[PDB]
Design a protein around this nucleic acid. Structure first.
Ligand SMILES: [Mg+2]
Ligand SMILES: [Mg+2]
Ligand SMILES: [Zn+2]
Ligand SMILES: [Zn+2]
Ligand SMILES: [Zn+2]
Ligand SMILES: [Zn+2]
Ligand SMILES: [Zn+2]
Lengths: 404, 49, 51, 46, 275, 49, 117, 490, 67, 73
RNA sequence: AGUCGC
């Protein structure tokens, strides 16, 4: 049948599927096609059409069927790659420290599909049998699919460290003859990125075996996940006394420096930058200070995260959310702004009646000091809602215009 | 007699305005119902500011 | 250019990892209500006769 | 014979099983809730 | 066979309410599956058919049926004498496969009446009543033992119904849970490192971790395996805790022996042609 | 209604303790349908005399 | 509505049989057992009893789909010993361990306790 | 504070908020005037001040969390949430079901959903007291784990403890009221409530008229379903105008009786007969139906996390802890970080401490309580991991899960929108006569629109036969004769 | 509404502890201690009894328990 | 074919003709039958307002004006 | 119409 959704933004939004009958009352979908439909399961409806002849059934099977909608011509990279929870579980699984006993390997082997039936020799024979994570993954990778590079997560170094002779810093993802040689897999390898592993399966071995490869990978990794687990709790949102003092102290340095710029402006000691007015210069300068403050403190928070942390594992895998979210949760929410600029003087020369007239200082006009964990003060709270509204309105307005 | 005007529920012109918790439970009306809205042909019709 | 169609269905969707990528699980009520028109051959005649 | 109709408040049987007006006798109300069937209906506890 | 363990048992502590014990020299899967049996596979008696004659209460009919469906039944008397509805030859229900209850109450007094399981009565002999003082003017009295509260009533309301309880087990509906709670724990010093503590000092030691009695916290042992499983089966009272465990072991034996017989039937009846 | 981006949709500064900051629909009518604050009250009107 | 009757979770269907055995052709000497209307309670235990056996090369089970009561067991043994016999023996062995566990438990309850019944 | 002692005294005295206004200690301020006041946030700040900021204040806030509107006050720690997250909750909270007024058993509302066992939230905001929300709760305190467990719960769905839904978790009763009038209506045509018969009426859909009582309408307690005709109305119509023995049968009157097309199962709750404002014999009949939480029903925590129930597992397979307190919902950990709804997490930890202490918890947004570290500290005194996690065992193979899962109470809502109402399929239905194309809504059992945009997509597919099938042969196919000599159809 | 028989989460019977509970609050207000005396150790059983609202007492006051 | 305001069962003279409204077909009780030109009742059919607006009625291509009082509206 | 769903 062909199954689809509205709005049908592009050809990948409507594709052929085989029915598989189950109990209860909803359409079940293989989690990995969630992205080309852009669905969730937060409550989304989908519609199914059943063709009515052999000519149209042939035309769908041959043209529109999902293993054939994989690499999109929209931008010659895959439309779908490993998503969500499985993707974090694949990161966690390929790390070099993962080891499995004869029982766990046999259980995972049992869930695979094309498994030849020959248990590979464990990477550690003595003192006890142990299989490594990468190794079990190599049973999933088709006939001889072979990538390179695609290490490019936060890890390793921003290009010069690895040339310092290659000391197995473990990030680089090397595969050969369809066998994973080293390095953690992630959004950069498995994602819908042009250079990805899923791209090489399709391009190399043909569409069908790639289709079974998506099925095969998601299933094996999810079972391992079942013994491993994954979570998030306030434990992920907490750093230490030293990070937190340094965060406050760094905000204290930034705020005092703004007061210095205000004093320079009131003293009329300041001069305009070329091509701009004095307010624009003052505003350009305070904005440069509050962003730079924000990024320095965010980079501090990134530095403090322990490696065990669940929160850091979702961003680094490339499952959900970004580095900036960790900043806001741990260190500081940062500047609020409407139409680009800082919160306008909606009152006579003020933002809220709680402030004094003419208070360009960072708090009365926008910038929130606290983190989502510490909570926002009342004013901080309301200014945040102004910044959140821009995001709600823009979604509705943009949706209509692109539609047209 | 010139006409019939709708009464807003539980205002001083409703029958409900003076009664305690006991009379309202007796009359079959929930004491916790906020009132303030018209009843028109069996429909609750609320005006919008 | 766009009209209502027959042989069509709609429900809420939920995830199923045990599912192949090009399969879709479908409720019994929709499977029994929806129909496909098969044509009878001299060999599958016996199976259709069963149905 | 739907000759029941529990009343608005007096709860006495209306007794009407015909075309006459549904005014409960003795009791002024004319809202008449309808009495249960003698029919047996089972509920599994599940 | 020359590799089967010796699975030993030890009872720590026992009450009429719970039974707490330790199993040693066994596999985790055994320890595990036995746990899944205490929940799902111990059969029991609970209301399954409710027929309502009258309901004038301030509550809808299915709601009364539901709450009643959860009322615990003293199956201390062997449920084994009493069959399943499907295997029993009779049409519908019967005295040999079912237990009959009647509830008939009305509030005539100018005082709010409470309807409680003591008002529900066994037509069946007193070997399967509700859990309310049918066996205990317990010198350890709690001036209540009202068992449960089906509904509340004011003057002029009535409730008349009949109900037929059946044997069934936890795999089919939660009313047939024999368990109130079922604790399970093993390797409480995390020696095997089956879970990994980040900052291992923040965790509190369990009631069995008192081995090192030392704050040294979780010594490692790489050659280890799982041993010594700790249990705490707690009964809702619908069945004696000791009896729940013993019936569970038997049900699992009956279930396994049946799979073996079915498998035997695979080569005995219609001989296998695997070779 | 239906095709017009505007600033009377965005929460305005003066809505502090007057109209709930975050209680307006998520559809096309976003921000146009607002919801009164908890402490907010509304003047009933009186003669200036 | 589309929800099965809950008893259909464990009662065998009149046109079905409890276990089914099919050979695997990918490798020599191996088998695939289908257990219908069973769950992890059974599937997981039989896996562990087989892995205890040193003649067994491979043993594993998988429940093909959660909504669907059925498990499959793959077992592979040495050419010198049929895989079917290991399975039958593994159950009997398991039956024996549970029987000894039941006797020791009743006896342990029989130990100087009171209110045992 | 002496004014406060009179306010305590109000419990037996005439002193009131109006007296408080009469002391002149509070004032009313409109938005135009609020521009010119210098307004302190809280007594604390107005006190410490010396050279801290200014000293010219003229008003002060009676409490800053008052800036929230009615629905936003239900949501606890709203300030630890990302701002639009709060807006989605204000919509959904308004969307949940529960008990909506107490006298609801005698109200004939067109459509209602009532929950079985609503609970007041363990974590609360002080404003919620003024909403009588303690009297009419909207949901239930779940034990929740944020884990991935079986991957069924990815992308905003949830794993649920099926035994918990069985022991009666989130069950609801649903009511629909069907209403019908006996209009005298026409000139000579006339309506009657009565049981129709295939001997003497026109209409007679194959649906069963046998459940109708001799009065013309069904009776309470009888089980009804998808094709049952609940009220028997008839319309005597032809009078006899077709001169002369247009008798045969079924000629006296047409059928138009009212029947189930929305409540495809249930019981008759009530049948109520009266006469309406026009003076016609009038009827309302109510059907109660019970919805069990099932795969497809939609739920949400109070911090705008909606998600569908993706599967349900037995209480055997849920993961379990120590005592074996298995979680009722597992919400997927990938949901939190990108939405930043950190407040949901504080609520578990606040919730765990309140339930465990036995005291209901405060979560009113703006206070000096520094509430994250101090809640964590209480929890450690009780004996859990000081920051909430627990060691949960794998429910299947009984093994221990390698890491810890975050678990504790949270108020959850079962929302109005439930799978059993939306599901739909068509396989040749009724046809509308302006277009001879299929119906539009389910109210007329219609098909779905293969829109301008879906069409465009098939072109890009180059599946032309299927495009031709759907925009033609599957909905509205017609044969016309045209003249060859001139292109006109006539 | 009324108290749900048997706590949702784990299964322990609980309706039986409601009437005893209201008597405790009239006595010892220590809600923790009152819950403790009833034997509801584990907190899911405790939230069960702790969070419930006994709506039936309001419902009983409508005149017609007859309809 | 003028002779059937509703009789049209080719094999045997009709007894009654039942309306399977949801499937949109006209069925003949004692054989199979499908004599269709389906119209559940054109008054139900105009109700093609739903998700579209309704109580100003853009779909109102037809006022009623209560003719059964007058001689003809 | 409006409410509302994504
Ligand atoms: Mg998405
Ligand atoms: Mg979505
Ligand atoms: Zn009367
Ligand atoms: Zn019998
Ligand atoms: Zn012509
Ligand atoms: Zn509990
Ligand atoms: Zn015929």
């Amino acid at each position: 049948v062909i199954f689809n959704r509205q709005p049908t933004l592009h050809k990948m939004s409507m594709m052929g599927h085989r029915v598989r009958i189950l109990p209860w009352s909803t359409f079940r979908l293989n989690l990995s096609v969630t992205t080309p439909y852009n669905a969730d399961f937060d409550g989304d409806e989908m519609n199914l059409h059943l063709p009515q002849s052999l000519e149209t059934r042939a035309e769908i099977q041959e043209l529109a069927m999902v293993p054939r909608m994989i690499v999109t011509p929209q931008s010659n990279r895959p439309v779908m790659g490993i998503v969500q929870d499985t993707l974090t579980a694949v990161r966690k699984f390929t790390k070099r420290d993962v080891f499995l006993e004869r029982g766990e390997v046999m259980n995972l082997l049992m869930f695979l599909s094309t498994w030849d039936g020959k248990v590979p020799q464990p990477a550690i024979l003595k003192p006890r049998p142990l299989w490594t994570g990468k190794q079990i993954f190599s049973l999933i990778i088709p006939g001889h699919i072979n990538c390179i590079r695609t290490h490019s997560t936060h890890p390793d170094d921003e290009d010069s460290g690895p040339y310092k002779h290659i000391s197995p810093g473990d990030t680089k993802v090397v595969v050969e003859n369809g066998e994973l040689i080293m390095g953690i897999l992630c959004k950069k390898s498995l994602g819908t990125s042009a250079g990805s592993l899923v791209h090489i399966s399709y391009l190399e071995m043909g569409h069908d075996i790639t289709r079974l490869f998506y099925s095969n990978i998601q299933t094996v990794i999810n079972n391992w996940l079942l013994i491993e687990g994954h979570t998030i709790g306030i434990g992920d949102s907490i750093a230490d006394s030293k990070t937190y003092q340094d965060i406050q102290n760094t905000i204290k340095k930034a705020k005092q420096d703004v007061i210095e710029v205000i004093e320079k402006a009131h003293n009329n000691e300041l001069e305009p930058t070329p091509g701009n007015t004095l307010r624009q210069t003052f505003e350009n300068q305070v904005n440069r200070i509050l962003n730079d403050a924000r990024d320095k403190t965010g980079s501090s928070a990134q530095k403090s995260l322990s490696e065990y942390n669940n929160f850091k594992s979702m961003v680094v895998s490339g499952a959900k959310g970004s580095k900036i979210n960790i900043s806001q949760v741990i260190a500081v929410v940062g500047q609020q702004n409407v139409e680009g600029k800082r919160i306008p003087f909606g009152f006579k020369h003020r933002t809220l009646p709680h402030f004094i007239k003419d208070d360009y200082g960072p708090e009365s006009r926008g910038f929130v000091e606290n983190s989502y964990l510490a909570g926002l003060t009342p004013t901080e709270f309301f200014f945040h809602a102004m910044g959140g509204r821009e995001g709600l309105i823009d979604t509705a307005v943009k949706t209509a215009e692109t539609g047209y | 007699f010139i006409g019939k005007i709708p009464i807003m529920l539980r205002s001083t012109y409703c029958l409900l305005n003076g009664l305690t918790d006991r009379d309202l439970c007796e009359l079959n009306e929930c004491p916790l119902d906020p009132g303030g809205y018209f009843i028109i042909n069996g429909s609750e019709k609320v005006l919008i500011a | 250019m766009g009209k209502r169609v027959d042989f069509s269905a709609r429900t809420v969707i939920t995830p199923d990892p045990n599912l192949s990528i090009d399969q879709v699980g479908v409720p019994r009520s929709i499977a029994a209500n929806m129909t496909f028109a098969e044509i009878v051959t001299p060999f599958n005649i016996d199976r259709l006769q069963e149905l | 014979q739907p000759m029941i109709y529990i009343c608005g408040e007096c709860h006495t049987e209306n007794e009407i099983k015909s075309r006459d007006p549904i005014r409960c006798r003795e009791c002024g109300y004319r809202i008449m809730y309808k009495k249960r069937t003698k029919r047996l209906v089972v509920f599994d506890a599940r | 066979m020359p590799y089967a363990n010796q699975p030993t048992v030890r009872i720590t502590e026992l009450t009429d309410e719970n039974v707490k014990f330790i199993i040693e020299n066994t596999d985790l899967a055994v320890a595990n599956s036995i746990r899944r049996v205490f929940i799902a596979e111990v059969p029991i008696i609970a209301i399954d058919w409710v027929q309502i004659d009258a309901n004038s209460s301030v509550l809808h009919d299915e709601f009364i049926a539901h709450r009643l469906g959860l009322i615990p039944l003293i199956s201390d008397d062997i449920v084994d004498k009493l069959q399943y509805s499907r295997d029993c030859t009779c049409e519908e229900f019967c005295p040999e496969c079912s237990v009959e209850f009647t509830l008939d109450v009305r509030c005539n007094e100018d005082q709010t009446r409470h309807v409680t399981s003591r008002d529900l009565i066994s037509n069946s002999p007193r070997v399967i009543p509700v859990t309310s003082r049918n066996r205990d003017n317990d010198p350890n009295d709690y001036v209540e033992q009202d068992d449960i509260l089906i509904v509340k009533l004011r003057k002029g309301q009535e409730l008349r119904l009949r109900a037929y309880a059946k044997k069934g087990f936890g795999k089919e509906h939660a009313k047939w849970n024999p368990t109130a709670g079922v604790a399970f724990e093993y390797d409480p010093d995390n020696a095997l490192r089956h879970t990994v503590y980040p900052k291992p000092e923040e965790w509190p030691k369990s009631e069995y971790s008192e081995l090192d009695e030392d704050e040294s916290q979780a010594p490692y042992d790489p050659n280890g395996k799982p041993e010594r499983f700790y249990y705490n089966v707690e009964s809702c009272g619908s069945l004696r805790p000791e009896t729940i465990v013993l019936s569970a072991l038997s049900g699992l034996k009956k279930k396994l022996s049946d799979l073996q017989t079915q498998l035997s039937h695979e080569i005995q009846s219609d001989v296998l042609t695997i070779n | 209604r239906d095709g017009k981006l505007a600033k009377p949709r965005q929460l305005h500064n003066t809505l502090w303790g007057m109209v709930c900051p975050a209680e307006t629909p998520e559809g096309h009518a976003v921000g146009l349908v607002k919801n009164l604050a908890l402490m907010a009250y509304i003047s009933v009107g009186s003669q200036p005399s | 509505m589309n929800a099965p009757p809950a008893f259909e979770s464990f009662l065998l269907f009149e046109g079905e049989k409890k276990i089914t055995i099919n050979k695997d052709t990918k490798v020599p000497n191996a088998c695939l057992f289908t257990i219908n209307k069973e769950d992890h309670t059974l599937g997981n235990i039989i896996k562990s009893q087989l892995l205890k056996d040193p003649q067994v090369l491979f043993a594993g089970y998988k429940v093909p789909h959660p909504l669907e009561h059925k498990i499959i067991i793959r077992v592979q043994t040495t050419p010198d010993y049929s895989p079917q016999e290991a399975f039958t023996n593994a159950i009997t062995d398991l039956i024996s361990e549970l029987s000894l566990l039941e006797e020791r438990f009743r006896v342990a309850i029989k130990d100087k306790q009171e209110g045992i019944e | 504070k002496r004014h406060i002692d009179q306010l305590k005294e109000r419990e037996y005295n005439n002193y009131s908020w109006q007296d408080l206004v009469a002391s002149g200690v509070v004032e009313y301020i409109d938005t135009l005037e609020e521009e010119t006041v210098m307004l302190a946030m809280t007594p604390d700040d107005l006190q410490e001040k010396e050279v801290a900021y200014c000293s010219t204040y003229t008003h002060c806030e009676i409490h800053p969390s008052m800036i929230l509107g009615v629905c936003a006050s239900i949501i606890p720690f709203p300030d630890h949430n990302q701002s639009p997250r709060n807006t989605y909750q204000s919509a959904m909270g308004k969307q949940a079901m529960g008990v909506y007024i107490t006298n609801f058993h005698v109200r004939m509302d067109t459509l209602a959903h009532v929950l079985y066992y609503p609970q007041k939230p363990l974590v609360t905001t002080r404003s919620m007291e003024y909403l009588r929300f303690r009297e009419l709760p909207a949901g239930i305190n779940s034990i929740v784990a944020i884990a991935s467990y079986t991957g069924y719960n990815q992308e905003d769905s949830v794993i649920m403890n099926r035994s918990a839904v069985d022991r009666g978790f989130f069950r609801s009763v649903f009511y629909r009221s069907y209403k019908e009038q006996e209009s005298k209506k026409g000139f000579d045509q006339e309506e009657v409530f009565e049981k129709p018969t295939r001997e003497t009426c026109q209409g007679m859909r194959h649906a069963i008229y046998d459940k109708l009582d001799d009065d013309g309408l069904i009776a309470p307690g009888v089980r009804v379903s998808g094709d049952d005709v609940i009220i028997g109305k008839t319309v005597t119509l032809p009078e006899n105008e077709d001169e002369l023995e247009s008798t045969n049968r079924r000629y006296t009157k047409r059928d138009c009786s009212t029947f189930l097309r929305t409540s495809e199962t249930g019981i008759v709750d009530q049948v109520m007969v009266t006469l309406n404002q026009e003076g016609y014999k009038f009827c309302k009949i109510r059907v109660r139906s019970v919805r069990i939480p099932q795969i497809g029903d939609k739920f949400a925590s109070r911090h705008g996390q909606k998600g569908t129930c993706g599967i349900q597992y037995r209480q055997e397979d849920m993961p379990f802890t120590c005592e074996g307190i298995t979680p009722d919902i597992i919400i997927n950990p990938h949901a939190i970080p990108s939405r930043m709804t950190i407040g949901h997490l504080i609520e578990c930890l606040q919730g765990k401490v309140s339930a465990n202490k036995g005291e209901i918890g405060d979560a009113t947004p703006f206070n000096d309580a520094v509430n994250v570290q101090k809640i964590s500290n209480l929890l450690s005194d009780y004996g859990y991991h000081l920051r909430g996690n627990e060691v949960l065992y794998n429910g299947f193979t009984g093994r221990k899960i390698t890491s810890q899962i975050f678990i504790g109470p949270t108020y959850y809502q079962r929302l109005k929108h439930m799978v059993d109402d939306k599901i739909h399929s068509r396989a040749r239905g009724p046809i509308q006569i302006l277009n001879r194309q299929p119906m539009e809504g389910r109210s007329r059992d219609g098909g779905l629109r293969f829109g301008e945009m879906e069409r465009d997509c098939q072109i890009a597919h180059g599946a032309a036969q299927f495009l031709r099938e759907r925009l033609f042969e599957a909905s509205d196919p017609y044969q016309v004769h045209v003249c060859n000599l001139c292109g006109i159809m006539a | 509404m009324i108290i749900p028989v048997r706590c949702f989460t784990c299964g322990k019977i609980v309706g039986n502890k409601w009437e005893a509970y209201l008597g405790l609050l009239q006595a010892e207000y220590t809600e923790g201690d009152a819950l403790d005396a009833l034997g509801l150790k584990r907190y899911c059983c405790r939230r069960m009894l702790l969070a419930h609202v006994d709506l039936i007492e309001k419902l009983l006051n409508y005149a017609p328990l007859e309809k | 074919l003028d002779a059937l305001p509703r009789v049209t069962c080719p094999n045997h003279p009709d007894a009654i003709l039942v309306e399977d409204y949801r499937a949109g077909d006209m069925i003949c009780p004692e054989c199979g039958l499908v004599v269709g030109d389906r119209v559940i009742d054109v008054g139900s059919e105009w109700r093609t307002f739903s998700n579209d607006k309704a109580t100003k009625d853009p779909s109102r291509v037809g006022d009623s004006q209560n003719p059964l009082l007058s001689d003809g509206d």
